[PDB]
Curated annotation (Swiss-Prot), chain B:
It comes from Saccharomyces cerevisiae (strain ATCC 204508 / S288c). This is Proteasome subunit alpha type-1. GO terms for cellular component: mitochondrion; nucleus; proteasome complex; proteasome core complex, alpha-subunit complex. The proteasome degrades poly-ubiquitinated proteins in the cytoplasm and in the nucleus. It is essential for the regulated turnover of proteins and for the removal of misfolded proteins. The proteasome is a multicatalytic proteinase complex that is characterized by its ability to cleave peptides with Arg, Phe, Tyr, Leu, and Glu adjacent to the leaving group at neutral or slightly basic pH. It has an ATP-dependent proteolytic activity. Transmembrane segments: none annotated.
Curated annotation (Swiss-Prot), chain E:
PANTHER family: METALLOPROTEASE TLDD (PTHR32194), PROTEASOME SUBUNIT BETA TYPE-3 (PTHR32194:SF10). The gene is PUP3. CDD domains: proteasome_beta_type_3. This is Proteasome subunit beta type-3. InterPro entries: Ntn_hydrolases_N, Proteasome_beta_3, Proteasome_bsu_CS, Proteasome_sua/b, Proteasome_suB-type. The keyword Coiled coil does not apply.
UniProtKB/Swiss-Prot annotation, chain F:
Belongs to the peptidase T1B family. This is Proteasome subunit beta type-4. It holds the Pfam family Proteasome. One of its GO terms (cellular component) is proteasome complex. It comes from Saccharomyces cerevisiae (strain ATCC 204508 / S288c) (Baker's yeast). The gene is PRE1. The keyword Nucleus applies. One of its GO terms (biological process) is proteasome-mediated ubiquitin-dependent protein catabolic process. One of its GO terms (molecular function) is endopeptidase activator activity. InterPro entries: Ntn_hydrolases_N, Proteasome_beta2, Proteasome_bsu_CS, Proteasome_sua/b, Proteasome_suB-type. Present with 21800 molecules/cell in log phase SD medium. The 26S proteasome consists of a 20S proteasome core and two 19S regulatory subunits. The 20S proteasome core is composed of 28 subunits that are arranged in four stacked rings, resulting in a barrel-shaped structure. The two end rings are each formed by seven alpha subunits, and the two central rings are each formed by seven beta subunits. The catalytic chamber with the active sites is on the inside of the barrel. It is found in: Cytoplasm; Nucleus.
UniProtKB/Swiss-Prot annotation, chain G:
This is Proteasome subunit beta type-1. Belongs to the peptidase T1B family. It is an enzyme of class 3 (hydrolase). SUPFAM superfamilies: N-terminal nucleophile aminohydrolases (Ntn hydrolases). GO terms for biological process: proteasomal ubiquitin-independent protein catabolic process; proteasome-mediated ubiquitin-dependent protein catabolic process. It comes from Saccharomyces cerevisiae (strain ATCC 204508 / S288c) (Baker's yeast). It comes from the Eukaryota. InterPro entries: Ntn_hydrolases_N, Pept_T1A_subB, Proteasome_bsu_CS, Proteasome_sua/b, Proteasome_suB-type.
Amino acid sequence: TIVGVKFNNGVVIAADTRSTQGPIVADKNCAKLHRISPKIWCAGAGTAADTEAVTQLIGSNIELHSLYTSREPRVVSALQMLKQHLFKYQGHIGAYLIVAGVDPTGSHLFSIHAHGSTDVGYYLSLGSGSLAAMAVLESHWKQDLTKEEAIKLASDAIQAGIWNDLGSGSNVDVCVMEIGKDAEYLRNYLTPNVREEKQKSYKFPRGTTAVLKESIVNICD
Amino acid sequence: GYDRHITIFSPEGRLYQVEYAFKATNQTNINSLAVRGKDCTVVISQKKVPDKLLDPTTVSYIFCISRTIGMVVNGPIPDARNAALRAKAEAAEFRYKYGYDMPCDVLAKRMANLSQIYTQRAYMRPLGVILTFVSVDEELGPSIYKTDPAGYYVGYKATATGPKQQEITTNLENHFKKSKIDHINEESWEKVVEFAITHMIDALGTEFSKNDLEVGVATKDKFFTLSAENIEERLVAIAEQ
Amino acid sequence: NNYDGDTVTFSPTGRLFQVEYALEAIKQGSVTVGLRSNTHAVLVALKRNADELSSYQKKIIKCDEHMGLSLAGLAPDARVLSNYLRQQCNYSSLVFNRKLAVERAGHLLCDKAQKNTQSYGGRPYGVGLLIIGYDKSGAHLLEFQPSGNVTELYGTAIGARSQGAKTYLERTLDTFIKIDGNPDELIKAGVEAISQSLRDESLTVDNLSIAIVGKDTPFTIYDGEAVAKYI
Amino acid sequence: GSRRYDSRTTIFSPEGRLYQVEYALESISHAGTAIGIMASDGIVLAAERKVTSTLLEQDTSTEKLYKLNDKIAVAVAGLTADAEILINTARIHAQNYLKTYNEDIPVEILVRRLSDIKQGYTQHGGLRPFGVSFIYAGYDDRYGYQLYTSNPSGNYTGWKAISVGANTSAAQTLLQMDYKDDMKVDDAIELALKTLSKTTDSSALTYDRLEFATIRKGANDGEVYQKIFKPQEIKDILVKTGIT
Amino acid sequence: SDPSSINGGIVVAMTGKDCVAIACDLRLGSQSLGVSNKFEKIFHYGHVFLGITGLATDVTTLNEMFRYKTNLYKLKEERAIEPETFTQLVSSSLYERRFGPYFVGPVVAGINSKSGKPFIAGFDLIGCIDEAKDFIVSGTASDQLFGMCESLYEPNLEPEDLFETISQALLNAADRDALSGWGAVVYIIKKDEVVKRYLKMRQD
Amino acid sequence: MDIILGIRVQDSVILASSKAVTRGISVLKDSDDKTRQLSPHTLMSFAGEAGDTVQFAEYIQANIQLYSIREDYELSPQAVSSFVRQELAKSIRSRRPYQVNVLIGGYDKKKNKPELYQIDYLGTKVELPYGAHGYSGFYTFSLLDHHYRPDMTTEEGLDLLKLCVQELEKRMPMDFKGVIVKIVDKDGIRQVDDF
Amino acid sequence: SIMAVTFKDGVILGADSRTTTGAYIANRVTDKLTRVHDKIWCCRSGSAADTQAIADIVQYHLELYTSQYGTPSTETAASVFKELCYENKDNLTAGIIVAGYDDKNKGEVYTIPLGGSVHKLPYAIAVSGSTFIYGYCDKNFRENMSKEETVDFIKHSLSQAIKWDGSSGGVIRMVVLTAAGVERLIFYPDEYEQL
Amino acid sequence: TGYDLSNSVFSPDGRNFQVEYAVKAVENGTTSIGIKCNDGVVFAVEKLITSKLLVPQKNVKIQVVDRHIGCVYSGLIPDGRHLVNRGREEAASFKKLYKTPIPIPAFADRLGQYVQAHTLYNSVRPFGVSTIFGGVDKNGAHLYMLEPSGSYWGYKGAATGKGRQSAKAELEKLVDHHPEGLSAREAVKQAAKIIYLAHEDNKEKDFELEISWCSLSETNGLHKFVKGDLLQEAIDFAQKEIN
Amino acid sequence: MTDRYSFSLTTFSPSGKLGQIDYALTAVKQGVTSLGIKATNGVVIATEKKSSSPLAMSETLSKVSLLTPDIGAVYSGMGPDYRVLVDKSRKVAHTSYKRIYGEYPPTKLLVSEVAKIMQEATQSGGVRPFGVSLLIAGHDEFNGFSLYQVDPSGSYFPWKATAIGKGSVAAKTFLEKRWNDELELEDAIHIALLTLKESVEGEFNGDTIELAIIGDENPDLLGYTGIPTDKGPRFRKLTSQEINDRLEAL
Ligand SMILES: [Cl-]
Ligand SMILES: [Cl-]
Ligand SMILES: [Cl-]
Ligand SMILES: [Mg+2]
Ligand SMILES: [Mg+2]
């Protein structure tokens, strides 16, 4: 479950922290929020390797572009470079991205689908929890949101995904990009899914495991 | 002495083919001038039509690169047009790849990096042209960036190019010592063109008719050239003061 | 002098010396004559031998049923250009079911020769060709030179002492142009023309080479006892 | 065209010599001396840094002695930049062999391939040859301790003791005079330094103008250690042999 | 015809107090047929340990590949590669074969020689990094290992204790998988010593 | 191309390979040698897709023979097996992969130890006291697990092989027309004339 | 549902705002009217990704054309669209309507359907899965209509399409191309539904 | 020195001597002219009759590009043909992508950039032709002249070859005496006269006249050759003016 | 057409000299003075901004370039050759390192890559050597602070302190007297300004002098918060004002 929400003086993106292989939870606290540039952040859904790889490649090329032009990078550059790359591979690179960030032109919020289609919105959501997240956004979104309102709406839309979607769970990651300020990245902003104390300690008596051989491994030169 | 025929170092660490490319720059015997207003960047160039059979409307050394970027060339028209077509291609490709209009200074750098390759690779000759790029950049504001056959480029408060470059340069240098500022403190581009022409007349010591000049103006979100009638109106204003 | 090293270098007077040297190879070549009426076009060629034990170098190459040439200069270069013509005549037949125009044949040879005069590493062709043919606009004779200059003519000659035959044809123009529906008489005029370029040596049975194309006559080459009639 | 400006780097002289190879060897003769001495129980590599400056960082510097793998090192004499191109090639070739056979590359095989690359630049490509001579010091389980040299020609040969670069004529006479077959590593260290000390164009041989390395079996039981000497370790071995 | 479950086998890695542990089974099979009971799936490049499950040809090939890459790293950098950096190199190398992948489930374990911080990571076949405080699991009995680890594991276990926990996690997971077992090896990794123990387990 | 066996005893490696070549419903040949000598002390048996087997075997033979001439040195069994594995590991992601399985038996003259390597068509290498490819191991692995010892003589190793071949001739559906047996020891490679 | 209509003063382009994955509306405020030049616009139907990729390339080609040869014709813009759509017809699913205003030619409308063919028409309408309709109440369309008439004609036409077709919906967007310049119109459901 | 031995080499002046040498080849060629008129352009050329044996009217030197552009050149004839072949490729690729037939200024730059490219490398030789070309587009009539350097401009009248200075002088008088403009049919007659007057600088061999024209009114904006009565009318006019 | 120059334009002369490298070094000698000094807690690199025209805006031309957050470069010689080398250097830091290991390269290894590019211009067909010498100052966790010189040949050497270009011989003598192993960063900046005043003839202020440091991490220049391990770039370019402040107490 990933979302983007525009407010008066910037944009905020949020994501859940669950990774799933079939019905199994592979990672309970993976980071779906990616830094393309210092003030351009990306929320990724789909194939986890693809969202990281495509986010780092464009992030690398954007950094080199910023050095070449001597200018802070723009979101439309990250958008154009991502969509053209994804289109080239005709959807085979399974990256569904919410791209948002503050640049010299202002605050921007975009979504990118794996086939290379892009959308513009004040509020967006992608992934298996998008329908749960979009229900909250469609219910509570209004024009001229404050920062505090936008964070609350974004985190609430993720929570809707965490509880109601089996593809989402664990914690809520937020990144706030305000105009004229440093982008603040709130890793584990909410932690509403803490494992309760176990009933018993499964610490074994030493010597419990049968051992055939022992040997010292030489890791030195 | 084959070290004077291709772009390899001479014993005293010089590239003669680059130095000779600079001399080709003045082959047209035309002088260009560029200045910055508050809201605009003006570029003026001498227009000489010696042949009576020439269609004067087709004789130009000012090119529209992008819709915001203007380029005046000092050098032979073949190399000028070679540089123009490439700049146009580069500005279009930039907009497609990165989703925003190529800045004046970034195009300048790109054309300067191309020029640098001709000074290092032997099979390519340098272009015998100096490119003056003008725009009102959305980040940096009124901008002048100039490229040469060595692959050198820099920004300018104002600049001049051609045979009588030094005379125009010192004329502008003296004005900016007096005004104490980095631009022409003027609201309308019309009066910035009037300044440019006035200071060229004072520097070269020649008068100008409507057909003796060629004018390019950069405003926010467009660069355009003036017609003979646009210049004529501008010359009348100077005369009546 | 300093400007003849390659074909990519102009002289201070605007000359291409490597091309002019290629042109010299043609003058050293044996004489060949071309002439035409409105109905027929004829090639006459003086073939050259190495010695009395050797054969006589074949001068005339067939390109299609309606077109062929005679050569003077580097024979291998004639083989390259005649092979190219054969392919272009062939392409016109297969793709458009159309006999290649003699004029287009000229244009294609010109443009092939030209590329070899503007590129470093390559050399100009060292041969001159006389192309004859009968197409939809009647009989045609062309003169090719490896500069790329192709010319349509009533008659001409190239090779050593060609000026003799070229002068005769210039005088005879009004006579031979009207030899319509009479092959033998048009050949006789071609044989009498090449005879003006002979010194000491005369036309023998295995020395003379004739070719003809016309209205109801495919491009055929006559050699040996077949040219005994015209001596 | 371009034919006018071609030096033709890969042609024979009327005497049947390769111009560019001969001139490259002339270049190498002006480079800092490198000495390799092979003992029964190890190999010594000693090299002289080219006229050092007082403000040159000595401790974190590598000009002459480079590691190819755990069992093979080279001493360089010529253009450092040219040497580094060839060294990175040699390092890869070694890892390609290890990947293919699961065995460390035998010394001669690595030397032959690096020598074959140099050869190529003298017979085709129309490029200048590599202005580099190497001393290869290495160990394998076939021939044990081995010394080789390669030069821009791509010719290589094996040695008990050898020098490359400046004053090789003088250096080779001194080595030929004092070297014997039943020599120890400690003895070979003393010979290498004494030889540089006499052939050097400098006033006196000091720690700051030297690079030093040994390939011993000094580690526990049938295994080879490569010791690239630190500045302080060169200072100590220079006092111990009584040169300072 | 599923490459990841032809040969079979498992790897598990765990963090303790100033230590890490990595363990694997020794089975290599051809589907139902057991072939080798000596096929170790854990390799080390200096002080960085790599376990690899999946298609056995790719396990051998990737070991040979990372030995090659870490050997060149050490020569150029003049120091052993650290776990955090090696993790990135595994990720880079797998995603390079995005549309023709190695059918593997690699696991990185080791202690950072500078910070002394225990480090473990897991990857999918195309190089996605799973960085975890607690434990990493891979192979044909991954479901079984997830169950054992999630119940048995507690934080800040001493080396001697952590050995028992990882051992019991592997042994009980392997015994509920047909394509895993036939012996097991556990590496206990402290800052400057590494003990390697072969476990006695049922041979069926 | 069906049955290839290998047993590593104290001082030698024994390879047994079926003699039958079957195309369609007919047995074309009953005397086929499914082995190539790679070097004087290294033998490789092979089985798999028709053509691919011999083509792969001869290609490896040529490459090892080339190394031997170039270095005037015999490559170790470990080195040869590693080379062969890498060739198969390349093959599997080719346009048309080699479908060949091999056993490599060699005597390492440096270690004075016999070595048996089993490599499948994927490039899955393993060192074993005894090995087999295809359905052969289905019967022989249980028998070898029972009777095999590390300190066995060559004669003991041949008797244990006879027990494997007898089990295969009893329970295998195809007539593989008996086996050619080859011993690899310190003295090189010899063929057991009668089996 | 998208249409373009020529009228007295120029040409109007109309489209809906609905983007669907299966039955889920991915975007309910989509802008399907795209600028390829100041007074050359297109209506996009079919794949969002494909139509965006094509429109971006066409915009690049017309920007480069303008630099070299000055303002391009609507016919030229249609040709560039066709070229991309025809040559890549195998890999592309894009149905496009090109509308532009010249001071010489006034309003022109070209349609590039799935084939990759080009057609010049007085007006065009595509509904459902890029399905172009012949006629669509030709008695409702006249030549040299007023702007107010043309807006009402498009508003009615698209509202009927949205009524009956679930792929169409949301707001009705329009773009008016005349000598005067570019005007953007929007009509919300509450206005256009009661027709 | 030796700065003139290799193309693309700048002299200490900043000159490409190899291009200036190519101009000498152009100056050596036969006279060719272009005249821009009210609604189109007229092209004329001098064809030297080397021999009686040359077939009259059947050695055409003026070439068409697309259907609306005329090209004539002086110098190395094959180099001209090579340039027109390229021009036809450029016009075809423009029409293929953009539909509209190539505008004349657009077409001018396509030749310009190609000729200029043959001054950037020593591996190639500059073109040994000056090319006079033009036609009718959407914006009206355009006449251009292109030189071995790649230099080109628009012209009211153009001339190149051995008789250029004579032709230029006669062209300059037409511009002065007709400021409001010259008609298409007039420009054909004037073209004939100027070639006959320019033939005085090449009077050893007698010559054959060849005229073509593009006119919005007379040819419907397409390139046609002047033949039959209209050609003989122009020859008669020229014959009357020399006497 | 096509690049027919597939042969070396740099060859050995009978004396064993590589002419084009020697001539390239001569071009570097004609170049404006630039220097580098290594302190215990940082590195300083400095150069004069020789302004082509007073109408020119010297701010736009940057002689001191960021290569990575922790590595900076200055030059002496041909400016254009430097500008394209900075571009190639920044890219190779990504393509051949960061996109593999997920971290920026250490100083010595980026230097090694720049050196390689310059060696190729010495041996490849149809190219002349680069007419520049680079000073590259950098920091990395395992090597700490370091300063490297790179020459047209491709050769590179590590320096405690050095100078290149016009007045390098005199500048190096000055640095030898002033340099010790106990220098703090502020002390090294002071010495850098003293050393550079000798080689500069005209105006000497923050507008005519370009100076950067590799020092402490700068969180304020990072552009984001929330990742404790990312503490910001060690490269900082000193402002016109910051230079003038240190010229008063000179
Ligand atoms: Cl323009
Ligand atoms: Cl660039
Ligand atoms: Cl869309
Ligand atoms: Mg050059
Ligand atoms: Mg089990």
